[PDB]
From a paper:
[name] proteins are programmable nucleases that have defense and regulatory functions in both eukaryotes and prokaryotes. Here, we describe a new class of pAgos that uniquely use DNA guides to process RNA targets. The biochemical and structural analysis of [name] pAgo (PliAgo) reveals an unusual organization of the guide binding pocket that does not rely on divalent cations and the canonical set of contacts for 5’-end interactions. Unconventional interactions of PliAgo with the 5’-phosphate of guide DNA define its new position within pAgo and shift the site of target RNA cleavage in comparison with known Argonautes.
The structure of PliAgo was determined by single wavelength anomalous dispersion (SAD) method with [name] labeled protein at 3.28 Å resolution followed by extending the final resolution to 3.1 Å with a native crystal. To elucidate the mechanism of guide DNA binding and cleavage site selection by the newly identified D-R pAgos, we determined 3D structures of apo-form PliAgo and of its complex with 5’-phosphorylated guide DNA (P-gDNA, 18 nt long), either in the absence or in the presence of Mg2+. All crystals were formed at nearly identical crystallization conditions and belonged to the same space group, containing one PliAgo or PliAgo-DNA complex per asymmetric unit. A crescent-shaped PliAgo molecule contains the N-terminal-L1-PAZ domains on one side and the L2-MID-PIWI domains on the other side, similar to other eAgos and pAgos such as TtAgo.
Numbering used by the authors: -1 to 766
Amino acid sequence: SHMTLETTLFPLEGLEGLTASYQLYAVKGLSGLDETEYHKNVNLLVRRLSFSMKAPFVALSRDGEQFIAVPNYVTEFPVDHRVVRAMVKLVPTGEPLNLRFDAADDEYDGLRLRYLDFVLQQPLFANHHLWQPGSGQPFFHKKPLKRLDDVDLYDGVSVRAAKHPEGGFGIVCDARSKFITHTPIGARADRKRLGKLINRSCLYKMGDHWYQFRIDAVSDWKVGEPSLFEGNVPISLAQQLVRTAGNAAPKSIIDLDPEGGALEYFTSTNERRMAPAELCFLIEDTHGRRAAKLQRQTILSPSERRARVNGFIRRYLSELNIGGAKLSAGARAHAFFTETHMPPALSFGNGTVLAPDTSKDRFQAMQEYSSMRRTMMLDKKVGFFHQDVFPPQTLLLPESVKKSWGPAFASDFVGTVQELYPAGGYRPEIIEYRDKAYGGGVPGQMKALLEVAERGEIKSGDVLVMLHRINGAPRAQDKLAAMVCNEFEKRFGKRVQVIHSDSPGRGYKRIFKNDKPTYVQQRGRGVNIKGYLKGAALNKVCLGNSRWPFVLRDPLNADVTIGIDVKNNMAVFTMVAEGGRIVRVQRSRSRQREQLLESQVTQVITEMLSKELPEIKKQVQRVVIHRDGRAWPAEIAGARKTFADMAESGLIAVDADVSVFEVLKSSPAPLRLFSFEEPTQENPKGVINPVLGSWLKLSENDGYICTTGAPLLLQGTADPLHVRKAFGPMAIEDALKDVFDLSCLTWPKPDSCMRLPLTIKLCDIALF
C-alpha cells in the first residue's frame, strides 16, 4: 500500500456558515496605464488600505482591477484616495458580495482566499514568540533553533491555506529556515563600516515588533540626534522609540547609545523611516557566501519536516479567535490514495526504446530506468537519438591560457567529446583573444573579444568561448557571459556557448616530463576534472549543437508547449514539439523589467513558429504555454491572439485551444507530500519521500507534481512543483501529467531527477 500519501493540507472547521465578504468598488484613475504599470498601482494601494485601516482589504480581479471593502469602515474616503499622485475615483458599484466558504467553485474563490488569509495571521502577528519578516511571509520563532558559530538559525513555518479537494477550505504548511547573525550591528559601527552594507537585509528587533528590512541610506543623524519633529522641535528617534513604546517597554528600546549608527529603509507602503544600528542584525545571504556547511543545516529529513509542521500546528494555530471565533485547524493532515505516473518511454538512437518495467516494484525499476538513460546514451550500439557530423566549430581561448594549459585541456576536451558523441567527429579551430592587453575588467575583455570577432578570426557558425569570472555571488550574474552572447549573436552570425577559465584551471598541474614542462590532469581537492570535461562536453557541445540524446517516444497531451521567462529586461522563449524532437530557444529584449509586452509576445511566437511548422507532421491542435512566474494579462492577450490568427490561416486545425499555466518554482502556497515505511528504529514515524510520479490536485486551478521524488532523491525532502492554471481549456491533471513527462527529459544530467520541465529549465540555463 505504498501509494497512500499524506500531505501538509490540514482541513479547516468553523467556516461552515461564515459568509463575511459584503462589498465592492471600482477603479477610475487608469486613463494612463501601461498594461503592466497599472498593476503596481493597485498593489501599493491595497496595502495602504489594508495596513492603515487594519482590517482585510482584498483585491484579486480580472480586467480593470476592483477592491473589496467591509461595510464597516466609519469613513472610507472613496474619491479621496491618492489625490496626492494620480487621483483614482473609487466608484462604489458595491453590490453586497457575501461569500461562503463551501460554495461551488466560483471566480470569487480568489477572494474567499485572500480574506481567509488576512485574518488567519492576526492570531499569529499578535502572538509574542512569533515574528513575521514582512507581509505574507513564513512565521518564525523569536527563539533560534541552533547556535552555529557567528550566526543564528531561526526556524519557522509558512501558512497560506487555499482550497481543499474534498470540498471547502483548509491549511497548507511547509517548514522553512532563515540565517541571521548573532550579534547586532552596533553603536560603535562607524560611517564607512555602515555604508559597506547598503542593500543587505537585517532583522530589526524593534521592541516586541520584529521585522525585516533592506538598507537604503546610512542616515544623516546618529541615534540621539534630532532629525524629525513631533511639535517642530526635532526629536531624536531615541525620543521617538520611547513615544511609540508600550508600558513594559523592553530595556533595549529606551536605553540606546546616542553615539551609534542609524539606518534607513522604506515601509511596505513606501514611507521613509529609520532604525538604530544597535538593534539591527544582518541576514547571512548564504548563497552570496558559499556557506556549504551552512547549507548542510537547512536540509531536513522527511520525518523531521513533518514533525516540525505538526508541532507548529498543534501549538499555535489551535484556539483561534477573530470576531467569528470558530475555525480550528483540524490537526490531522490530508491523505489520499493515488496512482502515481510512470516515467514515459523514450527513443534513443538506432530506434532502441527505453520503457520502465512494470513487474519490479516501482522503486527498483526506476533506478533501473534512470541509470539506463546514461548507459544507453553512451553505449555505441545505441547512443544518441540524433547522430550526425558536427558542422564546423571554434574553441576560443584566453591567450593567457593558450600558453599555459590550453593545449592539454583542449586535447582532453576534444577527446571527451568524441567518446560521448562519436558520430560528430569533433575537431574545433583554436582561436584566442588577447585577454591581458586591454583592461582586465568586463570592458576590455570585451574589447579583445570584439576585436577578434571584427577581424573575422571566427570562421564557422558555432563557438564556445572560455571567459574569466569577474565578481562573486550568484545574484551578481555574469554580465560578461550574457554580453558576449548578445554581441556575438546579434552583430556576427554566431551561436555561442560559454565556459570559464577558473574551473579547468584547477584540474591541471605542470609536471616535468622528458626534459620539458607539460600539463597533466590532477584529482586532489578542487574540481573533478574528468567529470567536468564529461559534463561540459555534453552540455556546451552536444546540446549546444542541438543533438538531443533521447526524446519521448509517445506523444504528450499538448502538441506544442512554450516556456517563457523574463528577468533583467531579457525575455527567453523555448519551444518543445514532437517528442522533444523539435526544440528552439530564442532571446529578445523586454522593455518592462520582468513583464514583456503583448505585441511582442504575439510576434516572437508567430515568427519562432511557422519556421518549425512544416516539420510538425500533425495538424497542431493543443498548444500550451508555461510561464516562469506570474503570467501578466498583457502576455495572455497575445497568447490567444497568436493562435487565433493561425486558426484563420490554416497552420492549425480551426479549433485550436491554447492554455496558459504558471510554474511556481517558488510556490506562493507550498506543500510537502509524504508516504511511509514500517517505522524502523532509525525513523520513529517511518516517513520517506513520495514516489517520483506522485501528484495532487486541490482545485481545478492548482496542483502539485513530484518531479523529484523517492527512488532518485539524494538527500532532503522532495519539493512538489506548484503549477497554477491561468487560462484555457486544458484539464489540469493532463497539464501536471506532461509537466512530469517534460521533466523526465533529463538532458543536462541523465541519471538524476530534474525538478523543472524541459521548457522552463531551458529558460533558466539560457540566461545563466
